[PDB]
């Protein structure tokens, strides 16, 4: 099948560093350079042979129309009140930017508040955060260019939605948090670096800093509030209490769910707000997450994992802050994660739990604890919900494998809370009840039970002969659960495909001892898991290695990378989203500092030999056997990936095309695609989204050979 040829390219053979006595040769690494013409004409050979390879099969264009069709329906969010007025997010279908509009009752007519498309042509521009003042009155908003993580963020008056002048630069990772008296915001922003700011530089993010700014005033009169120079990697965000009297600050190191936790009285100020606040450092160490809920006078309700692997709430008074006083309002369940809290009406928490992959959702009484409420859901996902302390309702969001799902609306100044459907529309071109979902639980190689979600056409015979698409992603203690997907379910239905969804170790499933089982000396776990997830599709007569594909993005793109390297036998195709795939520098880069939680870092010996075995960039090796190749792989990445550095797919694919694309026995396409005007993922445009999923089934059906189903 192999038309094309591959890119020559340089390699730097002197390029050798010694890591602990450990030599490493690194012949690509003069691509960690985004700006030199060697890496611009290397992404311009690179994507010159991808894109006729992605597009010479009718196949991608009967897809594209397909998924053009489906993604057509209309896409609300969850409602949420803010002062007299009710906001939600909308796209009619295919509108590159869902647009934000405002109504002033439940029942009135809607107008356009803030619509993003307008922005740019090609939708590149994002709207990424935001903070409305407390009453509701004026609105803080972060803007985002070609996906970038850099931020800047305006300002509207509310009424009227006029553009008010201030702006504020050097945005990044960044909380909104206004003050009650309405003055102006809590952000966070990165003092100047040399170069560029813009998403195509690599350079570390550190020193990230406080400020105050002032509604009203020039950026350059903004207030520093709190700063770390003893500690470059401490990020501290802000946020007001219910009540606007305290501003706690949540510090992290990392992306393990921990933080210091310290307040600040805001009556306390000699002044207001004029310099560094007079913290009061409650919590100060990074044993513990403390997540804020709700406060009544010096008593703060923060749902916490001290001592508590699946979560918990505890009341912890400032008047009497030891440890032993602390009051535990909800204990925590011996098996269910308890995801997210939040408190409405005054004296509610609605409470969040994970239970066996699945959200459930309730209603407590702040004062004690006490379950007052279920709200009944289908199998799936809680994906938006709104309720602050001073609202009489809630808004929140089902979604699940099969359904677009539903926004249900509740009345908590009710007697007999009845939740109502708010929102609900039907895909058409997708019968629901065709498909089946279905869970079990595998053997690991260890013998640990792990989750896997199978979603298949109902009435299929189990004979190995379907199509699979497994993913998985494995780390920071995110749980993966049921979503809807328009371009999965065209797989399904339009390509016969079995899809399915492995809940590996390191996620945040069955909470932290979850999490730990798959990160720093045990994130071969990981690996292990999603082999032993694609072992039982096999076994069980699901798909053939031959048919399998696996996916993953960012840590997913890790592990999809790695498993091709460990088990090349078992897939058929990879693709990997901007994955990480040098794990012995990607900490030298942007925000891949805070990652070392998860991974460890390189410049420790013992996490080296950890790493060194995984790293998929070192880890590229001929399969031993004459019968045996790599599978097919697709990398996919973007220029202005600041999240995960673009470096790591250009040097990965340097390695696969060279190491084993030269082989006589490699049939299979090793190829990445660039894009331009996009970055890791989030707030890419509805056109990019279609012309990505467009792109990687087609890598999928060509490399299969899988004929369309119409
Ligand atoms: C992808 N999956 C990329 C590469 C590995 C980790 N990662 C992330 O995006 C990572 C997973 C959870 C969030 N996150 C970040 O890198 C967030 C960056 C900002 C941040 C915020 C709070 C604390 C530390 C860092």
New binding site residues.
């Given amino acids: 099948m192999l038309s094309f040829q591959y890119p020559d390219v340089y390699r730097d053979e002197t390029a050798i560093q010694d890591y602990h006595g450990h030599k490493v040769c690194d012949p690509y690494a003069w691509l960690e350079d985004p700006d030199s013409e060697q890496t611009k004409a290397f992404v311009e050979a690179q994507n010159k042979i991808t894109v006729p390879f992605l597009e010479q099969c009718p196949i991608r264009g009967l897809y594209k129309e397909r998924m053009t069709e489906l993604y057509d329906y209309p896409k609300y969010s969850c409602h949420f009140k803010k002062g007299k007025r009710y906001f939600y997010f909308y796209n009619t279908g295919l509108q590159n930017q869902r647009v934000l509009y405002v109504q002033d009752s439940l029942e009135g007519e809607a107008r356009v508040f803030l619509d993003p498309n307008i922005l740019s042509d090609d939708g590149t521009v994002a709207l990424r955060g935001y903070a409305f003042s407390e009453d509701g009155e004026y609105f803080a908003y972060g803007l985002s260019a070609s996906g970038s ?1 850099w931020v800047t963020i305006k300002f509207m008056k509310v009424d009227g939605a006029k553009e008010l002048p201030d702006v504020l630069e050097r945005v990044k ?1 960044s909380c909104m948090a206004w003050t009650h008296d309405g003055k102006g915001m809590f952000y966070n922003a990165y003092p100047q670096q040399d170069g560029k700011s813009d998403g195509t530089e690599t350079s570390t993010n550190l020193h990230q800093k406080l400020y105050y700014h002032v509604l009203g005033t020039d950026q350059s009169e903004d207030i520093l509030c709190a700063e770390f120079p003893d500690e470059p990697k401490w ?1 501290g ?1 802000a946020e007001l209490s219910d009540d606007g009297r305290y501003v706690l600050l949540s510090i ?4 393990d769910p921990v933080n210091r936790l310290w307040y600040c009285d805001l009556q306390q100020e000699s002044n207001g707000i004029t310099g560094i606040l007079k913290w009061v450092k409650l919590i100060d160490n990074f044993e513990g997450e403390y997540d804020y809920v709700t406060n009544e006078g010096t008593v703060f309700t923060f749902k916490t994992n001290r001592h508590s692997p699946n979560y918990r709430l505890i009341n912890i008074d400032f008047t009497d802050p030891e440890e032993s006083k602390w009051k535990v309002l909800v204990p925590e369940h011996e098996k269910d994660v308890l995801e997210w809290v939040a408190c409405v009406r005054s004296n509610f928490l609605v409470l969040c739990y994970l239970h066996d992959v699945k959200n459930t959702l309730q209603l407590h009484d702040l004062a004690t604890g006490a379950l007052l409420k279920i709200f009944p859901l289908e199998v799936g996902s809680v994906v938006g919900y709104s309720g602050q302390k001073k609202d009489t309702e809630i808004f929140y969001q089902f979604t699940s494998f099969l359904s677009p799902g539903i926004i249900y609306h509740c009345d908590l100044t009710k007697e007999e809370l009845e939740p109502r459907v708010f929102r609900e529309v039907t895909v058409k071109g997708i019968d629901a009840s065709d498909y089946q979902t279905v869970q079990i639980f595998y053997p690991s190689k260890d013998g640990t039970k792990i989750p896997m979600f199978i979603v298949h056409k109902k009435g299929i015979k189990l004979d190995g002969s379907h199509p699979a698409f497994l993913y998985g ?1 494995g ?2 203690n ?1 749980s993966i659960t049921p979503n809807y997907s328009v371009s999965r379910l065209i797989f399904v239905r339009h390509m016969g495909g079995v899809l399915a969804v492995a809940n590996i170790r390191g996620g945040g499933e069955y909470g932290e001892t979850w999490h730990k089982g798959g990160i720093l000396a045990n994130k071969q776990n990981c690996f292990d898991d999603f082999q032993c997830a694609a072992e039982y599709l096999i076994k069980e007569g699901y798909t053939s290695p031959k048919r399998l594909t696996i996916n993953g ?6 592990l999809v990378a790695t498993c091709a390297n460990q088990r090349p036998d078992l897939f058929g195709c990879v693709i990997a989203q ?1 994955g ?1 795939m040098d794990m012995l520098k ?1 900490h030298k880069y942007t ?2 500092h ?2 070392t939680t ?2 460890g870092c390189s410049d420790s010996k013992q996490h080296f030999e950890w790493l060194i075995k995984y790293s998929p960039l070192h880890n590229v090796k001929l399969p031993e056997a004459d019968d045996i190749q790599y599978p097919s792989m697709l990398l996919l990445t973007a220029d202005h990936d600041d ?2 550095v673009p470096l790591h797919s250009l040097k990965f694919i340097a390695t696969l095309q060279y190491i084993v694309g030269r082989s006589r026995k490699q049939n299979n396409p090793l190829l990445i695609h660039v894009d331009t005007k996009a970055g ?1 993922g989030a707030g890419k445009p509805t056109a990019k989204v279609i012309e990505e999923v467009s792109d990687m089934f087609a890598f999928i059906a060509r490399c299969l050979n899988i004929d369309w189903i119409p």
């Fill in positions: 993580d990772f990020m965000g992290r190191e990392g992306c992603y780390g920071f995110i993005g960012s840590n997913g793109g890790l901007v990480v990607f925000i891949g805070a990652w998860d991974y999240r995960v890791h």
